[PDB]
Nucleic acid binder design. Sequence first.
RNA 1: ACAU
DNA 2: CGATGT
Length: 136
Amino acid sequence: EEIIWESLSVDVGSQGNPGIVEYKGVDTKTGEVLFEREPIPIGTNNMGEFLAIVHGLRYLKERNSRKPIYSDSQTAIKWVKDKKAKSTLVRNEETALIWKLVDEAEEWLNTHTYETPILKWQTDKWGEIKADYGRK
RNA sequence: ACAU
DNA sequence: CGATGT
Ligand SMILES: [K+]
Ligand SMILES: [K+]
Ligand SMILES: [K+]
Ligand SMILES: [Mg+2]
Ligand SMILES: [Mg+2]
């Protein structure tokens, strides 16, 4: 603790895993929805969590904001740190779109800088992240 | 085990 | 119960 309330919180939502994936980012303090990605027909939870963080980085950088990002995904936080999404999802025609977005997110990370802290949301202490989809 |  | 990940 404690929660850094001046922050952006992101989360994935899905219908199946693998399944339809979407994500959104919210103001941690107010819950205001700041961005929401159109659903992607097939992806994994972790790909979506990764895309949500990278989109947050891009959203904050464009707005000259130094706020941190919270994610509840140990996996996606590590993938962003490594600039490499180590997903097991088959690459095929059905998964081409999510894999294109993941490839492009990695490419963005490899061509841009940021100081944004990427912080673990401590669900066990604080409850569900503010960007959660309320589906579980 | 832990994080989803 | 199933799945994605370290
Ligand atoms: K949920
Ligand atoms: K969770
Ligand atoms: K497991
Ligand atoms: Mg999550
Ligand atoms: Mg959630």
